[PDB]
Amino acid sequence: ELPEDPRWELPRDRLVLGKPLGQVVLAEAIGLPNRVTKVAVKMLKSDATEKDLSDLISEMEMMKMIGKHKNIINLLGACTQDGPLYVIVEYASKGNLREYLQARRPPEEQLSSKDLVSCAYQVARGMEYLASKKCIHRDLAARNVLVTEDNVMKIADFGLARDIHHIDYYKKTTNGRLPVKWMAPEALFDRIYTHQSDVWSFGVLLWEIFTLGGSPYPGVPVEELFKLLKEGHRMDKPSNCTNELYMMMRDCWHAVPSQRPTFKQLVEDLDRIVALTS
Amino acid sequence: SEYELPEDPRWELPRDRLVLGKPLGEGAFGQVVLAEAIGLPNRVTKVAVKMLKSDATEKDLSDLISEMEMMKMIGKHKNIINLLGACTQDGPLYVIVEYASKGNLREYLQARRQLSSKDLVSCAYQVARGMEYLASKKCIHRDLAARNVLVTEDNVMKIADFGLADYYKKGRLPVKWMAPEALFDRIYTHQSDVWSFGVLLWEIFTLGGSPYPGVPVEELFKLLKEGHRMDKPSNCTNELYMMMRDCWHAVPSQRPTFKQLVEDLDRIVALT
């Protein structure tokens, strides 16, 4: 059924499947000849539909088109013949960014201010590459940034298939948060997604970094969030965050999409700030 | 109180010695107007006059009288709105209190978003002192918030509505200042006031910030149960934040007393 692609195919016997990561399982790839590499393997569930199959294929195809970058979860290979489709991608042993930040809050080693700004920089770089490749994430948040054993930030789920005109606004994340809290007003209210709306989301992610995994608008339900947005509300400055970095967040949250900085600009600014950060 | 109220020579002021002025505020069935009092002996003092609205009932009268009497029992203090007199005979009851030209603390703070770090800590010290006094006088405020702290022309903080006789009545929600036991176990104590003071401290350091914006009552209840605490404001020392966190201790007996808070705030103001 699936078309062969010599560019990415890995023999099934080269993939030693292991512990479920989240369907995604950790595995060891032999070769990719006598070396194993820990990798993450994406596959469908037993009750997956043909639509589910198509979405997994689309994501893999999208990853192929987009190409590689140090700050995104990269495609490593695939098992598409005679068996379940396996989409092999990079493994991030330290989990998502939200978790990573929370685990390092003071009463695991505390992150320095430079560490925090560097985290933001890497994310902005991953996004800068994605935007250059014509990709709009649509759900940029710390939950969607994974951290490798070497502390490299990698944007995940950038090629995910999603029907925006079918998003359940009242649906929560696994951690119990509302994804609508990362959406630009034009994406939320008008269903218009752009690189500009991704920048707004990046502003929220910046906030998450400086609050060390903080939850935006705690206790605020969908309906109330709509009202806050309509009224032009902006979250307060996290303590232990410079006015400069807060200004950046506020610029990312400009009501006018055309007035927000681009990821290219953000990368340059963050590059500047990191170097100047203690 | 239908035909005449009891007389108290000690506080009575002749109506001719009081010229009513512009209204300062309307409430449920109460009205407050600015006025000029003469000889509280030929000098005029700008004062605030609390009276009933034309639609008030006997119960409302009882409530205004109970408040005046409480003010009498409590006595005077620099950081509370003090009773200056009353017109109880031959006409509407007027409870004359100190006037605070700079409005409530919330508005005072926002209008100056310019106070120094010492000014902000000083504000908290003054409020805690007013409260330490009220607490020494057995008075439990039950709604201590920046909105209930008035500021005089000389920038003196004065606790208001401490003698006053629906979780969804706002456009902020007062339940957001309530201690858990007071909100859940309807238990009001001097320590529940301490929790409220912590939220007031937060208001001071955010310069009139709105606690829990967009958070409805039901959601607050959930946040409270989860042990959720508001984040440390920017431009707030970890010490002052720990004080807030202290005031927000789940066990009321573990929260500091206003006497402690006054001592600490006295110390911090100096080191600021």
From Swiss-Prot, chain B:
Residues the entry annotates as binding ATP: 24-30, 50, 98-100, 104, 147, 161
GO molecular function terms attached to this record: ATP binding; fibroblast growth factor binding; fibroblast growth factor receptor activity; heparin binding; identical protein binding; protein homodimerization activity; protein tyrosine kinase activity; receptor-receptor interaction
Domain Protein kinase stretches: 18-272
Cytoplasmic topological segments: 1-272
Outcome after substituting residue 142 to G: In HH2; with severe ear anomalies
Subcellular location, record wording: Cell membrane; Nucleus; Cytoplasm, Cytosol; Cytoplasmic vesicle
Active-site feature positions: 143 (proton acceptor)
Outcome of mutating residue 143 to A: Loss of kinase activity
Modified residues annotated as Phosphotyrosine in this record: 3, 167-168, 241
Effect of substituting residue 177 to R: In HH2; with cleft palate
Any one GO BP annotation for this protein: paraxial mesoderm development
Recorded consequence of changing residue 82 to K: In ECCL; somatic mutation; activating mutation; strongly increased speed of the first autophosphorylation and loss of the normal sequential order of autophosphorylation
Assembly mode: Monomer. Homodimer after ligand binding. Interacts predominantly with FGF1 and FGF2, but can also interact with FGF3, FGF4, FGF5, FGF6, FGF8, FGF10, FGF19, FGF21, FGF22 and FGF23 (in vitro). Ligand specificity is determined by tissue-specific expression of isoforms, and differences in the third Ig-like domain are crucial for ligand specificity. Affinity for fibroblast growth factors (FGFs) is increased by heparan sulfate glycosaminoglycans that function as coreceptors. Likewise, KLB increases the affinity for FGF19, FGF21 and FGF23.
UniProt record similarity statement: Belongs to the protein kinase superfamily. Tyr protein kinase family. Fibroblast growth factor receptor subfamily.
Disease: Pfeiffer syndrome: A syndrome characterized by the association of craniosynostosis, broad and deviated thumbs and big toes, and partial syndactyly of the fingers and toes. Three subtypes are known: mild autosomal dominant form (type 1); cloverleaf skull, elbow ankylosis, early death, sporadic (type 2); craniosynostosis, early demise, sporadic (type 3). Hypogonadotropic hypogonadism 2 with or without anosmia: A disorder characterized by absent or incomplete sexual maturation by the age of 18 years, in conjunction with low levels of circulating gonadotropins and testosterone and no other abnormalities of the hypothalamic-pituitary axis. In some cases, it is associated with non-reproductive phenotypes, such as anosmia, cleft palate, and sensorineural hearing loss. Anosmia or hyposmia is related to the absence or hypoplasia of the olfactory bulbs and tracts.
Name this polypeptide is given: Fibroblast growth factor receptor 1
Range of the intact protein held here: 461 to 761 of 822
